[PDB]
Design an enzyme around this catalytic site. Structure first.
Site, PDB file in Angstrom:
ATOM      1  N   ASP B 333     -41.606  28.147  -0.040  1.00 36.37           N
ATOM      2  CA  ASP B 333     -40.296  27.455  -0.157  1.00 36.37           C
ATOM      3  C   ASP B 333     -39.200  28.493  -0.571  1.00 36.37           C
ATOM      4  O   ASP B 333     -39.169  28.921  -1.714  1.00 36.37           O
ATOM      5  CB  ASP B 333     -40.501  26.358  -1.228  1.00 36.37           C
ATOM      6  CG  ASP B 333     -39.305  25.529  -1.426  1.00 36.37           C
ATOM      7  OD1 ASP B 333     -38.363  25.810  -0.646  1.00 36.37           O
ATOM      8  OD2 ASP B 333     -39.289  24.734  -2.420  1.00 36.37           O
ATOM      9  N   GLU B 370     -29.785  25.716  -2.133  1.00 35.52           N
ATOM     10  CA  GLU B 370     -30.450  24.435  -1.877  1.00 35.52           C
ATOM     11  C   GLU B 370     -31.141  24.052  -3.174  1.00 35.52           C
ATOM     12  O   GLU B 370     -31.178  22.846  -3.559  1.00 35.52           O
ATOM     13  CB  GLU B 370     -31.448  24.531  -0.688  1.00 35.52           C
ATOM     14  CG  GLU B 370     -32.054  23.159  -0.361  1.00 35.52           C
ATOM     15  CD  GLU B 370     -33.312  22.754  -1.124  1.00 35.52           C
ATOM     16  OE1 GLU B 370     -33.846  23.510  -1.973  1.00 35.52           O
ATOM     17  OE2 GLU B 370     -33.762  21.584  -0.904  1.00 35.52           O
ATOM     18  N   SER B 571     -29.332 -16.534   3.050  1.00 38.15           N
ATOM     19  CA  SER B 571     -29.912 -16.528   4.414  1.00 38.15           C
ATOM     20  C   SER B 571     -29.923 -15.135   4.999  1.00 38.15           C
ATOM     21  O   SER B 571     -28.919 -14.406   4.891  1.00 38.15           O
ATOM     22  CB  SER B 571     -29.139 -17.422   5.377  1.00 38.15           C
ATOM     23  OG  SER B 571     -29.907 -17.435   6.579  1.00 38.15           O
TER      24      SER B 571
HETATM   25  C1  LIG Z   1     -41.917  19.554  -1.892  1.00 34.91           C
HETATM   26  C2  LIG Z   1     -40.925  18.416  -1.546  1.00 34.91           C
HETATM   27  C3  LIG Z   1     -41.387  17.154  -2.281  1.00 34.91           C
HETATM   28  C4  LIG Z   1     -39.520  18.793  -2.065  1.00 34.91           C
HETATM   29  C5  LIG Z   1     -38.920  20.009  -1.317  1.00 34.91           C
HETATM   30  N1  LIG Z   1     -37.509  20.110  -1.719  1.00 34.91           N
HETATM   31  C6  LIG Z   1     -37.074  20.818  -2.765  1.00 34.91           C
HETATM   32  O1  LIG Z   1     -37.810  21.472  -3.517  1.00 34.91           O
HETATM   33  O2  LIG Z   1     -35.733  20.840  -2.969  1.00 34.91           O
HETATM   34  C7  LIG Z   1     -35.291  21.046  -4.321  1.00 34.91           C
HETATM   35  C8  LIG Z   1     -33.811  20.607  -4.399  1.00 34.91           C
HETATM   36  C9  LIG Z   1     -33.652  19.147  -3.896  1.00 34.91           C
HETATM   37  C10 LIG Z   1     -32.350  18.472  -4.373  1.00 34.91           C
HETATM   38  O3  LIG Z   1     -31.756  18.928  -5.372  1.00 34.91           O
HETATM   39  O4  LIG Z   1     -32.009  17.427  -3.773  1.00 34.91           O
HETATM   40  C11 LIG Z   1     -36.139  20.250  -5.347  1.00 34.91           C
HETATM   41  O5  LIG Z   1     -36.791  19.226  -4.982  1.00 34.91           O
HETATM   42  O6  LIG Z   1     -36.124  20.720  -6.491  1.00 34.91           O
HETATM   43  C12 LIG Z   1     -39.010  19.880   0.218  1.00 34.91           C
HETATM   44  O7  LIG Z   1     -38.286  19.010   0.785  1.00 34.91           O
HETATM   45  O8  LIG Z   1     -39.789  20.662   0.818  1.00 34.91           O
HETATM   46 ZN   LIG Z   2     -36.840  24.520  -0.224  1.00 41.38          ZN
HETATM   47 ZN   LIG Z   3     -37.639  24.140  -3.416  1.00 47.55          ZN
END
Ligand SMILES: CC(C)C[C@H](NC(=O)O[C@@H](CCC(=O)O)C(=O)O)C(=O)O
Ligand SMILES: [Zn+2]
Ligand SMILES: [Zn+2]
Ligand SMILES: *[C@@H]1O[C@H](CO)[C@@H](O[C@@H]2O[C@H](CO)[C@@H](O[C@@H]3O[C@H](CO[C@H]4O[C@H](CO)[C@@H](O)[C@H](O)[C@@H]4O)[C@@H](O)[C@H](O[C@H]4O[C@H](CO)[C@@H](O)[C@H](O)[C@@H]4O)[C@@H]3O)[C@H](O)[C@H]2NC(C)=O)[C@H](O)[C@H]1NC(C)=O
Ligand SMILES: *[C@@H]1O[C@H](CO)[C@@H](O[C@@H]2O[C@H](CO)[C@@H](O[C@@H]3O[C@H](CO[C@H]4O[C@H](CO)[C@@H](O)[C@H](O)[C@@H]4O)[C@@H](O)[C@H](O[C@H]4O[C@H](CO)[C@@H](O)[C@H](O)[C@@H]4O)[C@@H]3O)[C@H](O)[C@H]2NC(C)=O)[C@H](O)[C@H]1NC(C)=O
Ligand SMILES: *[C@@H]1O[C@H](CO)[C@@H](O[C@@H]2O[C@H](CO)[C@@H](O[C@@H]3O[C@H](CO)[C@@H](O)[C@H](O)[C@@H]3O)[C@H](O)[C@H]2NC(C)=O)[C@H](O)[C@H]1NC(C)=O
Ligand SMILES: *[C@@H]1O[C@H](CO)[C@@H](O[C@@H]2O[C@H](CO)[C@@H](O[C@@H]3O[C@H](CO)[C@@H](O)[C@H](O)[C@@H]3O)[C@H](O)[C@H]2NC(C)=O)[C@H](O)[C@H]1NC(C)=O
Ligand SMILES: *[C@@H]1O[C@H](CO)[C@@H](O[C@@H]2O[C@H](CO)[C@@H](O)[C@H](O)[C@H]2NC(C)=O)[C@H](O)[C@H]1NC(C)=O
Ligand SMILES: *[C@@H]1O[C@H](CO)[C@@H](O[C@@H]2O[C@H](CO)[C@@H](O)[C@H](O)[C@H]2NC(C)=O)[C@H](O)[C@H]1NC(C)=O
Ligand SMILES: *[C@@H]1O[C@H](CO)[C@@H](O[C@@H]2O[C@H](CO)[C@@H](O)[C@H](O)[C@H]2NC(C)=O)[C@H](O)[C@H]1NC(C)=O
Ligand SMILES: *[C@@H]1O[C@H](CO)[C@@H](O[C@@H]2O[C@H](CO)[C@@H](O)[C@H](O)[C@H]2NC(C)=O)[C@H](O)[C@H]1NC(C)=O
Ligand SMILES: CC(C)C[C@H](NC(=O)O[C@@H](CCC(=O)O)C(=O)O)C(=O)O
Ligand SMILES: *[C@@H]1O[C@H](CO)[C@@H](O)[C@H](O)[C@H]1NC(C)=O
Ligand SMILES: *[C@@H]1O[C@H](CO)[C@@H](O)[C@H](O)[C@H]1NC(C)=O
Ligand SMILES: *[C@@H]1O[C@H](CO)[C@@H](O)[C@H](O)[C@H]1NC(C)=O
Ligand SMILES: *[C@@H]1O[C@H](CO)[C@@H](O)[C@H](O)[C@H]1NC(C)=O
Ligand SMILES: *[C@@H]1O[C@H](CO)[C@@H](O)[C@H](O)[C@H]1NC(C)=O
Ligand SMILES: *[C@@H]1O[C@H](CO)[C@@H](O)[C@H](O)[C@H]1NC(C)=O
Ligand SMILES: [Ca+2]
Ligand SMILES: [Ca+2]
Ligand SMILES: [Cl-]
Ligand SMILES: [Cl-]
Ligand SMILES: [Zn+2]
Ligand SMILES: [Zn+2]
Lengths: 693, 693
Positions: B333, B370, B571
């Site tokens: 990552d 990110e 509804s």
């Molecule tokens: C491993 C997954 C669950 C999360 C991973 N995303 C990620 O690590 O983004 C960061 C930042 C996400 C945010 O701040 O919205 C986090 O989750 O700390 C991904 O989408 O691959």
């Molecule tokens: Zn990432």
């Molecule tokens: Zn990450």
């Protein structure tokens, strides 16, 4: 052949006259049966005239009506509680209409009910600056008083909002002869002036673009979830009622307390125009009492929507719309406009029957409930907002075709300035003394631009008509045109009165229907060019010119406060930079538009799309502060007068009366925030004109 | 020739491997010099590879870092105030990296500073239902307690929000071996499991789509006006810090008070998992003390934006984006994704050098920050939102290419389902036992759809990655694809730890880079089809199918409450009607798309525009309640777990825990309001597919 000239030559003054007569024989008040029958007539005729499809689009919206068996009126009441003077229950009907049923009596639409009784304060036009003068300079407190205000200068909804924030417990609106009786002309039926028994109807909402007070954001369709009345948008909290100047004279003649602060506070009645509070010594124990029993009720309205499918770009919409509902007979407002639309549809339909179609789709609309707050146009635009923001090229409004007989009036986006100059140079002036001269020539002579020699004045779009949702909310290029007089916001003398009839128009405004015909040629000619020019007829360089003018203007307002601009580091550099960039990029875009390979329909369309989405680029999806449906960052209706346009309204409102704010750091921070939003939006709009990749 | 096969055959596993090695030798933390140098390297290489233009877009956004000379740690403190146990100041660095500088120690980005001291409560995963169980069933009060929560199941920002609303004064997050240690595999460096000293970094904001906490709505450019910290979006109010399971065992082992309520509360450590509050009798006077000294500071970030101009529709953008910033080395990552993007750009560039161009423009992005809240993608989209909403065809994300080696995972809009099925049928499976079989075949076998036989599972887009602004805010059709394991939201064991290295990937996940290559073929193949198919490769009928499934699901939730639905007349008829209409209109649109005159580029484009703006039609410009940047009415990130998607989120949140609301009339009114908004939006989206005039 089938060109603009064919279209224009088919339009006939005599047809507009017949249509106006046909549309003004009975009242067409929104939500009434008569107005539904007229909708059905229009729909049938537009089908006859040759449109591809003509549908009614209906909504169930909050409207307001007086109680037929419990009339609204105002009294002077003595200390015993005897009502010694009562205002009139109706306007005397004009000659030959004295037996017409269902004339709605004068009232202020959406007033709450109540019976407040108190001392009067006279507040001039009830403008923001009138209340500043009363409360800051004259030290008169309106709390728990009934205010009396003359109509004129600003939208009446703003007068009511201002009275309410001053703590008033009721508002009385009246037409002063200073504003509604032109010297040397006779009262109706013998001339076009307001008689003393005449009264201007009109709603007093402060919707800020929301449409139906109960369904902001979404169409008031069959399954809509409504707000409760307490959470409705824009309703007044205090009772309000309008009166004529015979009745106003009775209420004003006894006023005591302070003298008027100067001559700009005195109208033309034979009274002192004392501000009060209350009456002079002898009558000091008498009070004024309002009796308002109008009711708000959810009521069905009907828009007529006609479509003429485009031959080449059927997914691009040029819209000609104006309303059909009137307060009473609608002789000028709106049927002088609706008759013009009817004749335009008829002319387009003639060309269609001979095999022609416009390049782009033309939509024609007969809107309902404009008088109750632009409700029909706004609900339809809420319903169709996705179609309109991806496909909407332009919106041309078509309310009253005349408000005088002196010269042309145009208010529009800068994107239309070139189109309007070019079209008016090709049209004949209808004016006495300009026989054989162009409309451009007569208009420029009678209404010169304050900035540029040899150009006519073209105003900003403000609001108070059905273009508001298309321009201010959706960012579709919009314009309007009518014949006008030599204060534009007060209305003509018989505005919204029972006296606005067919005869008013035929006898006093436009006997030969030549001004109606000229207005049909301007509105229809605009629609024709917008729907038929290969390249959309918008010039982005004209936006660049006005953006610099507006930047200069807002900078100048801020520069009244040099010490604060130093202290809080308030710079307009970013806004001027954005405007300089917009000017540069627009100039390069214009070169490509002239130079691009004209055999390439994709480049043309990329470039037509760049032109169409340029007005769209000025929309901020977060809206202006506390006004989420005013999204255009360059133009919004003035916070002090819905009818008037304000430029850079976010910065303008952040600066307004800033010297009075208790926390200057916070107030100047918000100025800077608005400068950033404006600079960013201008730059972002500029970048939509850059090469796309 | 130059077709998709040419593109796909140029992609090489060995190139992805070299790029991954190149990108993972030093840390690339957002806002650091190292990450700026990598940005500059990418920009240079993408130019070399043949893109038309490659620019850096920079912003100055709020980031968060530990204090280098005042480290964060947690203690157990005795009654004298002696610190008898301290958590670790850093993770033991992996073999051969023990001399790498600037490894950021474990911390929770955006934690405020503080030194809170108190009794522990163990809150399991700190989910909404975990706090319900504690407070409603077990009657344990978290007010003024330090909570300790195991990572897993939901985004850690939601755990912190939940702890804060429970009145906690601090939060300790830890990785339990139950969730981060797969049975029978060794700890890093000998296998892919988390060691006891390993710690997961990660931000704990609750931005709800806002981007930079200081500039919601607008890009954080040079002249931006910032909010003060007190008005920033999404910052936590209590200190937070993450630890490994060696340290967690020390903190948990002494816990007293109530037993865990059941086995779903017990992890795998040799401790009772008592909920507390506080420690058992002997240690009842000892407390836990946090020491957090991290600082928030506005810091420059850099996106790399590469453009490959379209030959025919250069004003239509297909975007491939993924981030470049990492917590430490980013071995999975994000660099397993970034290496894949790099090889895709290289392959497209090879075709470009031979004279080919895609039909539409392809934009390639290397996003920054990110990890600190999707800041780089969100600020760039704020800057360019007008271009993206008029021109954006699709967004394909490209974060981690692998999170396991078992099968493919795809999450995307229903508009892409057909495209994904068709592409995967043409790709070779890389899986053992499926030699010579399609990826579609292996994927469908290993990950069957719960609804449809012979189909693979495709999930909703949730959030926690850089597609959020494009999909949830702007309504651009979006998708993502990676290789995965057999709880998806917890992350793989070494997620956000110093141990996520090149060697982890090369030794344990994908030694032959075959899963990386398959992921490059899926992402690149999607981009190729989106940017090159004459007719956009979206099938609106697939949206109709899922809308019916989501309508059934939300109706079923409401039907748990039949008495209230009778009382308040709740509804779902309007929503089912809208879905039925969408199904009918989509079916007719599909017929025209097959049948339309294929020689007519205007009909094609009207129809390509109808396809492109269909996802856009689900955007409500007013946003969801209290979440103005989540505008899509069909999908939003779950209010209880940012990573998960929720369908009809406005109605779902109105119904959630409704039986607990003190005013049921008001709560059920809001359910009805959300049903109206959903029905209207579905109908309005359907109508964008009707014949245009
Ligand atoms: C491993 C997954 C669950 C999360 C991973 N995303 C990620 O690590 O983004 C960061 C930042 C996400 C945010 O701040 O919205 C986090 O989750 O700390 C991904 O989408 O691959
Ligand atoms: Zn990432
Ligand atoms: Zn990450
Ligand atoms: C009107 O149009 C012009 C373009 O003609 C815009 O000019 C840009 O202005 C911004 C802000 O003033 C400039 O931003 C500066 O960028 C520098 C780096 O620029 C290089 O690299 C970028 C990629 O990141 C390229 O796009 C660019 O071409 C350059 O090669 C930064 O180093 C600057 O920051 C430093 O100085 C400032 C101010 O002293 C400090 O606050 C910082 O801390 C830092 O030390 C700065 O951010 C940008 O370069 C200009 N673009 C150009 C010339 O192409 C105007 O912005 C535009 N007006 C509006 C309102 O948008
Ligand atoms: C799914 O798609 C269908 C279209 O196939 C839509 O059906 C529309 O449904 C609405 C609401 O149910 C109908 O509204 C009704 O309109 C009647 C008049 O309709 C005629 O005139 C209009 C122009 O005004 C034309 O468009 C139309 O073709 C008809 O010729 C009204 O009289 C109805 O109101 C009366 O009944 C109701 C309910 O009992 C009362 O509350 C009222 O007070 C009043 O007495 C009603 O408003 C509409 O006609 C239908 N259009 C059709 C069939 O074309 C669905 O709405 C759509 N689903 C969603 C969620 O949008
Ligand atoms: C309003 O009318 C004016 C005057 O006709 C229009 O401007 C004119 O537009 C034409 C067509 O774009 C221009 O002709 C071009 O000239 C250049 C050479 O300078 C050449 O390269 C092109 O092939 C083409 O022949 C003309 O210059 C221009 N005149 C001006 C600006 O003074 C204007 O477009 C009209 N406004 C509309 C339609 O909105
Ligand atoms: C995924 O692949 C499937 C299978 O190829 C694609 O569906 C197929 O699309 C073609 C082209 O639109 C259809 O051909 C058409 O058939 C009709 C006669 O039934 C004819 O009138 C047309 O001229 C044309 O030949 C074909 O029917 C269709 N097959 C199906 C739906 O089973 C699908 O489009 C692909 N998805 C994408 C590209 O997103
Ligand atoms: C306004 O004009 C319309 C259209 O000419 C008139 O409506 C028509 O009246 C005739 C005679 O009553 C009917 O046979 C038609 O069915 C009507 N056509 C429609 C409604 O499309 C209407 O009478 C005129 N109104 C006035 C006040 O003169
Ligand atoms: C103004 O109108 C009011 C209301 O109609 C008049 O006062 C009423 O007179 C009737 C009949 O004489 C009494 O039975 C009621 O008790 C009165 N009602 C109220 C509310 O006072 C009043 O006479 C009128 N004043 C003038 C000058 O015409
Ligand atoms: C990652 O790869 C890049 C590109 O091959 C390497 O950067 C180049 O290094 C050489 C030798 O130092 C220089 O002459 C070039 O100027 C660099 N090119 C660039 C920056 O585009 C980089 O050294 C590699 N990094 C690692 C850690 O192996
Ligand atoms: C945990 O860390 C703290 C802080 O470094 C240690 O306590 C300090 O010890 C130094 C040197 O012996 C003293 O001068 C300070 O007064 C102490 N500071 C505080 C804040 O208490 C403590 O020894 C460590 N505990 C363990 C078990 O290693
Ligand atoms: C006469 C002008 C000032 C106002 C006139 N508009 C108008 O009468 O609209 C109505 C409704 C306007 C509104 O509610 O915004 C009104 O002002 O009461 C027009 O634009 O012709
Ligand atoms: C109007 O007033 C009458 C008679 O005074 C009363 O019976 C009725 O309640 C009122 N009507 C409405 C619509 O409020
Ligand atoms: C005006 O009068 C009201 C009511 O008596 C009072 O509460 C208020 O403070 C006064 N305001 C000013 C500005 O004098
Ligand atoms: C029509 O034109 C004449 C000539 O200027 C003018 O005196 C008259 O007042 C006009 N009518 C209206 C309604 O303005
Ligand atoms: C970090 O802590 C040090 C030493 O304890 C201190 O001098 C400095 O103020 C802090 N640095 C920041 C960036 O807050
Ligand atoms: C929990 O504890 C706090 C602080 O002592 C107290 O104010 C609060 O009312 C308690 N809440 C419940 C639900 O028992
Ligand atoms: C790679 O694949 C094998 C075969 O199923 C598996 O046992 C091993 O655990 C996998 N590696 C990872 C990191 O999942
Ligand atoms: Ca509405
Ligand atoms: Ca921002
Ligand atoms: Cl008008
Ligand atoms: Cl991803
Ligand atoms: Zn009108
Ligand atoms: Zn009017």
């Amino acid at each position: 052949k089938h060109n603009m000239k064919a279209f224009l030559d088919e339009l006939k003054a005599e047809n507009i006259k017949k249509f106006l007569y046909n549309f003004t024989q009975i009242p067409h008040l929104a939500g009434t049966e008569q107005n539904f029958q007229l909708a059905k007539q229009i729909q049938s005729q537009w089908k006859e005239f040759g449109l591809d499809s003509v549908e009614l689009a209906h909504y169930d919206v909050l409207l307001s009506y007086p109680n037929k068996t419990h009339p609204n009126y105002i009294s002077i009441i003595n200390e015993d509680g005897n009502e010694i003077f009562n205002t009139s229950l109706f306007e005397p009907p004009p000659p030959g209409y004295e037996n017409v049923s269902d004339i709605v009596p004068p009232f202020s639409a959406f007033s709450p009910q109540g019976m407040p009784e108190g001392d009067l304060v006279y507040v001039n036009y009830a403008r923001t600056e009138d209340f500043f003068k009363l409360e800051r300079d004259m030290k008169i407190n309106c709390s728990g008083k009934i205010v009396i205000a003359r109509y004129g200068k600003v939208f009446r909804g703003n007068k009511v909002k201002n009275a309410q924030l001053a703590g008033a417990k009721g508002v009385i609106l009246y037409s002063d002869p200073a504003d509604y009786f032109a010297p040397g002309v006779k009262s109706y039926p013998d001339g076009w002036n307001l008689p003393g028994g005449g009264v201007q109807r009109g709603n007093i909402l402060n919707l800020n673009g929301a449409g139906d007070p109960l369904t902001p954001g979404y169409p008031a369709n069959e399954y809509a979830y409504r707000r409760g009345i307490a959470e409705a948008v824009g309703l007044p909290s205090i009772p309000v009622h309008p009166i004529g100047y015979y009745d106003a004279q009775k209420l004003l003649e006894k006023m005591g307390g302070s003298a008027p602060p100067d001559s700009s506070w005195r109208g033309s009645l034979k009274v002192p125009y004392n501000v009060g509070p209350g009456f002079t010594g002898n009558f000091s124990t008498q009070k004024v009492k309002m009796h308002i029993h109008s009711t708000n009720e959810v009521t069905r309205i009907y828009n007529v929507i006609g479509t003429l499918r485009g031959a080449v770009e059927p997914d691009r919409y040029v819209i000609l719309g104006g309303h059909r509902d009137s307060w009473v007979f609608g002789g000028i407002d709106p049927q002088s406009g609706a008759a013009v639309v009817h004749e335009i549809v008829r002319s387009f339909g003639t060309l269609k029957k001979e095999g022609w179609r416009p390049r782009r789709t033309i939509l024609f609309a007969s809107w309902d409930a404009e008088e109750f707050g632009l409700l029909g146009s706004t609900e339809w635009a809420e319903e169709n907002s996705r179609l309109l923001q991806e496909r909407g090229v332009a919106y041309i409004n078509a309310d009253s075709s005349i408000e005088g007989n002196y010269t042309l009036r145009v208010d529009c986006t800068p994107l239309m300035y070139s189109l309007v100059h070019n079209l008016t140079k090709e049209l004949k002036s209808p004016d006495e003394g300009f026989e054989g001269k162009s409309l451009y020539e007569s208009w420029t002579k009678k209404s010169p631009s304050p900035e540029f020699s040899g150009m006519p004045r073209i105003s900003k779009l403000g609001s108070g008509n059905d273009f508001e949702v298309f321009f201010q909310r959706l960012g579709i290029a919009s314009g309007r045109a009518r014949y006008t007089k030599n204060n534009k916001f007060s209305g003509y003398p018989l505005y919204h009165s029972v006296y606005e009839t067919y005869e008013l128009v035929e006898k006093f405004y436009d006997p030969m229907f030549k001004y109606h015909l000229t207005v049909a040629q301007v509105r229809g000619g605009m629609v024709f060019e917008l729907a038929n020019s290969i390249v959309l007829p918008f010039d982005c360089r004209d936006y660049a010119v006005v953006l610099r003018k507006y930047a200069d203007k807002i900078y100048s307002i801020s520069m009244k406060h040099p010490q604060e601009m130093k202290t809080y580091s308030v710079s307009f550099d970013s806004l001027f930079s954005a405007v300089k960039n917009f000017t540069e990029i627009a100039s390069k875009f214009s070169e490509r538009l002239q130079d691009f390979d004209k055999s390439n329909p994709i480049v043309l369309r990329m470039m037509n799309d760049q032109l169409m989405f340029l007005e769209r680029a000025f929309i901020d999806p977060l809206g202006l502060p506390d006004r989420p449906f005013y999204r255009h960052v360059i133009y919004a209706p003035s916070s002090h007068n819905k009818y008037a346009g304000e430029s850079f309204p976010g910065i303008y409102d952040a600066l307004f009366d800033i010297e009075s704010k208790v926390d200057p750091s916070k107030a100047w921070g918000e100025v800077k925030r608005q400068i950033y939003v404006a600079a960013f939006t201008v730059q972002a709009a500029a970048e939509t004109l850059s090469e796309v990749a």
